[PDB]
């Protein structure tokens, strides 16, 4: 049955690009804590990240972040195949530009003052055709690459140079904005949010199974608490 | 007055094809506990089942199941004639197929994995033009025969072979779906359900008698209890 694909869930870590697995995971694929990992999915697209070792998260499970779930076009309850990729990469020239939807009121240079400080001491990889999201600068902005060195061989380094043209390109309907609300945006409701997972993930992720079995799913859920507790973004995130 | 026909009622046994009678019943028709019985009715159709001996059900009464009440087109308050039929039968080739109304989401082979396991150690008979119902497999599905060996001589055996064509035939309005609610679907309400039998079976089963006598039937029945006790499927089953 090809025991290599595992289900996807939410990661409790607050890091940006960190993938956490269980102890008997890197011992089979002989990968270290700072190796290069390549992930695939639908739409004939690939991905690259950094695998981090952890033995406190769970017993046998792989964590997976939100900034790359929308990037690789992956949703919950899906299978993902992981394999090591010991390929030496080195970025030479990069060219990123933001979308004209979140750059209102920003003028002047914006590449040598935000991007350069956060790239160093991170060595984060990047693949062709990906929309990364960065927090900071009293705002939430993103950038998209359209033309750089041929994939892959993309490694951030202070010696790398950057350039701009001066004409942002509008986004399309294929991607989804990460500025909206997700499971990571809920704080404090752990036990209560854990219940909705085992009541709304079965009928919404597996429709043919429900139109196959005779089980009746719940037809209504009532949330409680005083106003402002977060009854609205929970429903928006689970959607 | 031909003392051979008896009224029909509901059977408390949970078995699929079991007919229970009283002690002075098989002693007149010299039939054993595992003989072959042939039953007739309207529409010039016959039936075949297995008579089971019981001395705890009642004093002088014949039980009769739901899966064959709709099959032989029999309703309550009707007469049924029973006679032994010591005919040796042996099935050779069978060909059953389901109706395209309850096979949504089912693919692959479905004859050597469900039908074969449940047929053995049962020796259940089957007549031509009957819609049997089987419970199990996390669903409620049925099958209908359209072409097999000439009637009767239909006995299930592991040596028998089966085949399929690949085109289900839709059901007609002559038969009724057994997936709906009947008296056997009510659990717990025994004393209360027993009362509705002696108040709604007289005016609905014998209309000419009520338009003959001057008795006024009840014009309204009020059911009680907290929600979910089953006030709705009781009314749907008695209809
Ligand atoms: N438990 C929570 N977790 C994260 N954010 C919250 C929570 N509760 C409130 N908020 C924040 O407060 C803001 C106002 O929430 P509000 O719409 O009043 O919630 P509700 O509609 O349930 O009263 C939201 O933008 C949300 O980000
Ligand atoms: N006494 C009972 N016997 C069998 N099934 C029941 C009974 N009570 C409830 N149910 C089941 O519970 C489900 C919901 O019943 P419901 O429609 O709430 O009854 P009511 O309309 O009387 O409140 C039904 O599908 C029924 O099968």
Curated annotation (Swiss-Prot), chains A, B:
Binding residues for ATP 1: 227-233
PTM annotation, UniProt: Phosphorylated by tyrosine kinases in response to T-cell antigen receptor activation. Phosphorylated in mitotic cells. ISGylated.
Span of the entire protein shown here: 21 to 259 of 806
Comment, domains: The PIM (PUB-interaction motif) motif mediates interaction with the PUB domain of RNF31.
Result for mutant: residue 111 to R: Severely reduced binding to DERL1
Signal peptide location: none
Subcellular location: Cytoplasm, Cytosol; Endoplasmic reticulum; Nucleus; Cytoplasm, Stress granule
Subunit structure: Homohexamer. Forms a ring-shaped particle of 12.5 nm diameter, that displays 6-fold radial symmetry. Part of a ternary complex containing STX5A, NSFL1C and VCP. NSFL1C forms a homotrimer that binds to one end of a VCP homohexamer. The complex binds to membranes enriched in phosphatidylethanolamine-containing lipids and promotes Golgi membrane fusion. Binds to a heterodimer of NPLOC4 and UFD1, binding to this heterodimer inhibits Golgi-membrane fusion. Interaction with VCIP135 leads to dissociation of the complex via ATP hydrolysis by VCP.
Biological role stated in the UniProt entry: Necessary for the fragmentation of Golgi stacks during mitosis and for their reassembly after mitosis. Involved in the formation of the transitional endoplasmic reticulum (tER). The transfer of membranes from the endoplasmic reticulum to the Golgi apparatus occurs via 50-70 nm transition vesicles which derive from part-rough, part-smooth transitional elements of the endoplasmic reticulum (tER). Vesicle budding from the tER is an ATP-dependent process.
Parts of the chain that traverse the membrane: none
Effect of substituting residue 212 to E: In IBMPFD1; increased ATPase activity; no defect in ubiquitin-dependent protein degradation by the proteasome; impaired autophagic function; defect in maturation of ubiquitin-containing autophagosomes; decreased interaction with CAV1 and UBXN6
Family recorded in the similarity comment: Belongs to the AAA ATPase family.
Effect seen on changing residue 163 to W: Severely reduced binding to DERL1
Effect of mutating residue 66 to A: Strongly increased affinity for ATP. Strongly reduced affinity for ADP
Disease affiliated with this protein: Inclusion body myopathy with early-onset Paget disease with or without frontotemporal dementia 1: An autosomal dominant disease characterized by disabling muscle weakness clinically resembling to limb girdle muscular dystrophy, osteolytic bone lesions consistent with Paget disease, and premature frontotemporal dementia. Clinical features show incomplete penetrance.
Residues bearing PTM Phosphoserine: 17
Phenotypic consequence of residue 165 to K: In CMT2Y; normal ATPase activity; impaired autophagic function
Name this polypeptide is given: Transitional endoplasmic reticulum ATPase
Impact when changing residue 135 to C: In IBMPFD1; also in one patient without evidence of Paget disease of the bone
